């Protein structure tokens, strides 16, 4: 009657977890292959596939690769252990505005030199957040990380610029891309295509406001693992950017010393001119329109005849209650209570005060700390807010979240899935040997 | 309605050549194998030749094997037969027929479903 016929090269695939590799044009390795330009995207006319962000292993690989590469870049850099001494800190002899009182201290200490028997007196300007007083009323302070792990100075030649990385599949595997403009991160996607390699993703690291990501094609999309579970974060993708202008308006003179045999330490020597607080500007009208759109979409998940309230984060350390980001190499911690203070019921700008830290932990880890060299001159950066990370408490109250970096990466990788190709299979025919 | 229409030749001399053709409509031409069946005026039916739906495989009754060529054009919905050396014994009606073979992923046939009107070929 019918016989088994074996076919090889059958267009069938199964979900699979494999290793992806990097393709690009220092956030390189020089081990990323060249992009292999203009990737091809076969449309798969009648393929519907099931996607499930949050269970997507591509996120885990991006997370692990970024952390590993980050740590690798510090391996050859100077260890600042000669600086764990009792710093004698006094008030800065300059014109300080009210917003900056107590923010900077002028600290003197004895540093090591190129020779084992020679010592040098060094003074520098530190941000208050980087030091901890050991004496009660005394001017004796110590660096924040001399009781926990030693601080590594980042190499001054290595930038933190978020250069895009494309993730490519190994032979035998394929990456499927969801093109449904209204896709909410899970479930069937009616329009799926095959990319050889993903688009480049910029590894921008930030907390509560996502910067320089992709925008939604048509409307604000709210994605969450479980929208009624207050233990979950809500990722909101905007369809329009909100432009944010950040500055550190203080002309920084950077000086250096030797602390050992080819080991140099960089520090702020002095400030030219007045001392002002770092800050970021968000256009007021643009921001209010943006929230109105977010609220309209939240009302589709929550009651319609409801009240939506925005509020500032309730607690935790500076790393989780503020908007943390890298602006020109400096690490800013901006207060967003000026953005999330409103209730929505059924040429001005907003200025966000910012704090600066030189000694940071980056990742949510205990045993590592990095010293970011201060940057010469004045810093200005402009970026796009492309999405928000919110958490939820009648009336629904939402607050900024985003402490877990995997959420930043989910906002870009949500449209991709990795599958394994299984070209061998059988079917009945009327053909026999 | 399925139609097969022969638009062939007429009266020819022995040893020469004559070409037949058949136009088809009302079905997907390319989905079916086709054949020619012959009927002399005083005789029954005889199978002459068979061609696969993609045009790759041809079969012939041995009596015409070295003389006839069967072909196909799926763009023009046309079946054709070129006969050479025209034997006197080849005088007959030549019918365009649909069926006689399938393609291993299709249900089998081994019978003819549709017939044309028949071209009359005469050899003097």
């Amino acid at each position: 009657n019918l016989w088994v016929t074996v076919y090889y090269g059958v267009p069938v695939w199964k979900d699979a977890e494999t290793t992806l590799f990097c393709a690009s044009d220092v956030w390189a390795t020089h081990a990323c292959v060249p992009t292999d330009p203009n990737p091809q995207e076969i449309h798969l006319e009648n393929v519907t596939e099931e996607f499930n962000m949050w269970k997507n292993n591509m996120v885990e690989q991006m997370h692990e690769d970024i952390i590993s590469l980050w740590d690798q870049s510090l391996k050859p850099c100077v260890k600042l252990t000669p600086l764990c001494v009792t710093l004698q800190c006094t008030n800065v002899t300059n014109n300080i505005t009210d917003d900056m009182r107590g923010e900077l201290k002028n600290c003197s200490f004895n540093a090591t030199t190129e020779l084992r028997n020679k010592r040098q007196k060094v003074y520098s300007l530190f941000y208050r957040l980087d030091i901890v007083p050991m004496g009660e009323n005394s001017t004796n302070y110590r660096l924040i990380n001399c009781n926990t792990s030693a601080i590594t100075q980042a190499c001054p030649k290595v930038s933190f610029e978020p250069i895009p990385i494309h993730y490519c599949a190994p032979a035998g595997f394929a990456i499927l891309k969801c093109k449904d403009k209204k896709f909410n991160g899970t479930g069937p996607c009616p329009s799926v295509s095959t990319v050889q390699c993903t688009h480049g993703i910029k590894p921008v690291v930030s907390t509560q406001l996502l910067l320089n990501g992709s925008l939604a094609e048509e409307e604000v999309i709210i994605r969450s693992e479980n929208i009624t579970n207050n233990a979950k974060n809500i990722l909101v993708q905007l369809n329009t950017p909100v432009q944010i202008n950040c500055t550190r308006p203080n002309n920084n003179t950077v000086k250096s010393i030797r602390i050992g045999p080819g080991q140099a330490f960089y520090y702020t020597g002095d400030i030219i001119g007045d001392i002002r607080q770092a800050h970021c500007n968000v256009s007021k009208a643009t921001w209010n329109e943006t929230l109105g759109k977010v609220v309209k979409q939240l009302r589709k998940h929550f009651g319609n005849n409801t009240i939506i309230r925005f509020a500032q984060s309730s607690g935790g350390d500076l790393e989780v209650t503020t908007h943390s980001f890298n602006c020109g190499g400096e690490f800013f911690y901006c207060n967003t209570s000026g953005l999330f203070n409103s209730t929505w019921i059924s040429n001005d700008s907003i200025t966000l005060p910012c704090r600066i830290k030189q000694i940071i932990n980056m990742w949510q880890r205990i045993g590592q700390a990095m010293y970011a060299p201060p940057i010469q001159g004045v810093i200005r950066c402009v970026s796009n807010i492309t999405g928000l990370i919110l958490t939820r408490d009648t009336t629904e109250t939402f607050r900024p979240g985003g402490g877990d970096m995997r959420d930043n990466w989910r906002s870009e990788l949500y449209k991709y899935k990795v599958v394994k190709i299984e070209p061998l299979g059988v079917a009945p025919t009327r053909c026999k040997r | 309605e399925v139609q097969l229409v022969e638009t062939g030749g007429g009266l020819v001399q022995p040893g020469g050549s004559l070409k037949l053709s058949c136009r088809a409509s009302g079905y997907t031409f390319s989905s079916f194998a086709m054949s020619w069946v012959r009927q002399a005026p005083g005789k029954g039916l005889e199978w002459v030749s068979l061609i696969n739906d993609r045009g790759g495989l041809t079969f012939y009754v041995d009596s015409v094997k070295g003389r006839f060529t069967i072909s196909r054009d799926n763009s023009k919905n046309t079946l054709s037969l070129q006969m050479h050396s025209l034997r006197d014994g080849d005088t007959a009606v030549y019918y365009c027929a649909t069926g006689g073979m399938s393609s291993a992923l299709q249900s089998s046939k081994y019978y003819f479903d549709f017939w044309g009107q028949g071209a009359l070929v005469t050899v003097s």
Binding site: T19, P170, A171, P423, A427, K432, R433 | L105
Partner: protein, 120 residues
């Protein structure tokens, strides 16, 4: 027309693009990439080994001498080869695949011995 372009098409159409997919099966920081390449190669070789065992080496379409017990799938040639896509078919005869592979292996062994005892 490219890799997996036929994935949404019917089996009777998709079967004509077998070479398109076949040609896309081949080709410490950096170690994980070598590990992936080695495993991709081993996977490839295992598929080739099965085709070898079943007597389908060197071809993309291979007919066999094993019949189709209707208990695996009682659908007729029309429904399989002119409606279903390969993805849907694979999800039907997923449970009854190891059985089929075992039968194909046994059939080829019987064929090899008989052939040898005929060239004797």
């Amino acid at each position: 027309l490219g890799f997996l372009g036929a994935a949404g098409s019917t089996m009777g159409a998709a079967s004509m693009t077998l070479t398109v997919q076949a040609r896309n099966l081949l080709s410490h920081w950096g170690i994980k990439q070598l590990q992936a390449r080695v495993l991709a190669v081993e996977h490839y070789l295992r598929d080739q080994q099965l085709l070898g065992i079943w007597g389908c080496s060197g071809k993309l379409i291979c007919c066999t001498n094993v019949p189709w017990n209707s208990s695996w799938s009682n659908r007729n040639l029309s429904e399989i080869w002119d409606n279903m896509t390969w993805l849907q078919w694979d999800k039907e005869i997923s449970n009854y695949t190891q059985i089929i592979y075992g039968l194909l292996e046994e059939s080829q062994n019987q064929q090899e011995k008989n052939e040898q005892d005929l060239l004797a």
